[PDB]
UniProtKB/Swiss-Prot annotation:
Notes on the domains: An N-terminal fragment (residues 1-523) can be reconstituted with GyrB, but the complex no longer has negative supercoiling or ATP-independent DNA relaxation activities, although it is capable of DNA cleavage; ATP-dependent relaxation is inhibited by novobiocin and non-hydrolyzable ATP analogs. The fragment has ATP-dependent DNA relaxation and 30-fold improved decatenation activities, unlike holoenzyme it preferentially binds supercoiled DNA. The C-terminal domain (CTD, approximately residues 535-841) contains 6 tandemly repeated subdomains known as blades, each of which is composed of a 4-stranded antiparallel beta-sheet. The blades form a circular-shaped beta-pinwheel fold arranged in a spiral around a screw axis, to which DNA probably binds, inducing strong positive superhelicity (about 0.8 links/protein).
Cellular compartments annotated: Cytoplasm
UniProt motif (GyrA-box) ranges: 22-28
Additional free-text comment from the UniProt record: When the enzyme transiently cleaves DNA a phosphotyrosine bond is formed between GyrA and DNA. In the presence of quinolones this intermediate can be trapped and is used as an indicator of drug toxicity. The enzyme-DNA intermediate is also the target of a number of topoisomerase poisons, including toxin CcdB. Few gyrases are as efficient as E.coli at forming negative supercoils. Not all organisms have 2 type II topoisomerases; in organisms with a single type II topoisomerase this enzyme also has to decatenate newly replicated chromosomes.
Family: Belongs to the type II topoisomerase GyrA/ParC subunit family.
Name recorded for this polypeptide: DNA gyrase subunit A
Signal peptide positions (record): none
Residues of the full protein shown: 539 to 587 of 875
Organism encoding this protein: Escherichia coli (strain K12)
Subunit structure: Heterotetramer, composed of two GyrA and two GyrB chains. In the heterotetramer, GyrA contains the active site tyrosine that forms a transient covalent intermediate with the DNA, while GyrB binds cofactors and catalyzes ATP hydrolysis. Can form a 2:2 complex with toxin CcdB in which GyrA is inactive; rejuvenation of GyrA(2)CcdB(2) is effected by CcdA.
Function in brief: A type II topoisomerase that negatively supercoils closed circular double-stranded (ds) DNA in an ATP-dependent manner to maintain chromosomes in an underwound state. This makes better substrates for topoisomerase IV (ParC and ParE) which is the main enzyme that unlinks newly replicated chromosomes in E.coli. Gyrase catalyzes the interconversion of other topological isomers of dsDNA rings, including catenanes. Relaxes negatively supercoiled DNA in an ATP-independent manner.
Length: 49
DNA sequence: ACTGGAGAAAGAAAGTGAAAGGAAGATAAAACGGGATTCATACACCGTTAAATACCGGTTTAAAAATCCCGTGGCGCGTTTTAAAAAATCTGTGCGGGTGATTTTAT
């Protein structure tokens, strides 16, 4: 899974099989919904156990 | 006149019914956040080419690395406190036969 954390503190993880590889130079798809004033600071990849 | 019992007055202490109010609860309206559709529209993938960049050979030189002396504060040791977690000890409760008790209405 992949773990994301926001500045004010919000945790969540998603299955890794949802995002598919592509070629460099793209824009990508949104991974989470941000609030009015917040931003993502960390990103982690790890196993459930 | 005097005595001792008895009833009535008077006074002081305790129990009482009623008391704002305030923290401590409780209950609704509201604002919120997370899923099912619906596409148009912007994004992903495939051929072409000018241009921008990586790479090699040889200097150099100024800057950073290496070395030596020393004087301290930042870790290390030993011994106390102090919360935190764990083990030990109490407290209720229901199963089924027995003893004894309570309340409200109409005519």
């Amino acid at each position: 899974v992949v773990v994301t954390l926001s500045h004010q503190g919000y945790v969540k993880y998603q299955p890794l099989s949802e995002y598919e590889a592509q070629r460099r130079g793209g824009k990508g798809k949104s991974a989470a919904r941000i609030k009015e004033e917040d931003f993502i600071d960390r990103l982690l990849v790890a196993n459930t156990h």
